[PDB]
Amino acid sequence: HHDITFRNIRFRYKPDSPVILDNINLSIKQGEVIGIVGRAGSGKSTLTKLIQRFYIPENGQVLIDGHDLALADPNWLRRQVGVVLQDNVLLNRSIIDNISLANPGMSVEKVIYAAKLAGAHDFISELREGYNTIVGEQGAGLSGGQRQRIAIARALVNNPKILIFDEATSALDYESEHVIMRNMHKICKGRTVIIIAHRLSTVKNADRIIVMEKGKIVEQGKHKELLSEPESLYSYLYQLQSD
Ligand SMILES: Nc1ncnc2c1ncn2[C@@H]1O[C@H](COP(=O)(O)OP(=O)(O)O)[C@H]2O[C@@]3(O[C@H]21)C([N+](=O)[O-])=CC([N+](=O)[O-])=CC3[N+](=O)[O-]
Numbered sequence: 001h002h003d004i005t006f007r008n009i010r011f012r013y014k015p016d017s018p019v020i021l022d023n024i025n026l027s028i029k030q031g032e033v034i035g036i037v038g039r040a041g042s043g044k045s046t047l048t049k050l051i052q053r054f055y056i057p058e059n060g061q062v063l064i065d066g067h068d069l070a071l072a073d074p075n076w077l078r079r080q081v082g083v084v085l086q087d088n089v090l091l092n093r094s095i096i097d098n099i100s101l102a103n104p105g106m107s108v109e110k111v112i113y114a115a116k117l118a119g120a121h122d123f124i125s126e127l128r129e130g131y132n133t134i135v136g137e138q139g140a141g142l143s144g145g146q147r148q149r150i151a152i153a154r155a156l157v158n159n160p161k162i163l164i165f166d167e168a169t170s171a172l173d174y175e176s177e178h179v180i181m182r183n184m185h186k187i188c189k190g191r192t193v194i195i196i197a198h199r200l201s202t203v204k205n206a207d208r209i210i211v212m213e214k215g216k217i218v219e220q221g222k223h224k225e226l227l228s229e230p231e232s233l234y235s236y237l238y239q240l241q242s243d
Pocket residue numbers: 013014017018020038039040041042043044045046047
């Protein structure tokens with residue numbers, strides 16, 4: 001079963017603006033972990049925006065489960081998809097408020113469970129105020145990698161069947177990243193996962209990596225097969241990022 005299908009997707013942001021996605025054809029099986037790589041501006045983020053129907057393609061179809069999103073309940077779609085955002089944890093609100101923000105009227109139990117998968121529960125439990133800790137620096141003063149784990153928990157809180165990791169902007173501390181990587185298989189368990197990867201190394205063990213260039217998927221496959229393809233863009237980007 002495919003959880004995410006793109007068929008002949010053409011997309012531009014404004015009626016006269018440039019074509020950002022040209023003839024995107026993609027089918028992601030249920031429970032697959034997909035890495036998406038490519039130069040800045042290749043259209044990786046744009047792709048995930050269409051998954052959430054933040055925008056509507058001029059040509060082609062985006063389907064979840066087989067449900068064309070043109071016809072799908074927008075309320076249903078919001079619940080299917082969890083997004084791990086970057087640098088979007090409200091400082092003026094509590095950790096629990098930041099985790100349950102997408103649906104404010106849930107349960108402490110669901111929140112904790114999400115924080116546990118996120119690898120955030122342990123450090124939250126050791127704060128004076130616990131989950132009621134105001135993220136802002138006049139309460140305790142959390143770090144970037146901590147806030148990132150909260151962001152993961154927020155994405156996870158409603159048990160989305162599809163999880164999207166927005167490209168990492170900032171660089172995270174060792175403990176956070178080690179915790180995140182250690183927990184990834186648990187974070188991803190039972191979910192169709194998309195990771196937009198800054199460093200190619202991040203998605204090396206993805207089931208499949210999608211290589212985008214100038215709004216096209218140019219290459220796709222496992223790390224090994226992508227490197228085996230002579231003159232592949234993938235191999236070039238790997239080389240550029242190698243020590
Ligand atoms: N809300 C929005 N409204 C309009 N366009 C949006 C947009 N969000 C993204 N874009 C543009 O679409 C293209 C794809 O961006 P994106 O999907 O974010 O790529 P990555 O995720 O691969 O980094 C980008 O190309 C560029 O701007 C971006 C881009 N860039 O990403 O540096 C640079 C230039 N430029 O220097 O003229 C032009 C671009 N463009 O789409 O015309």
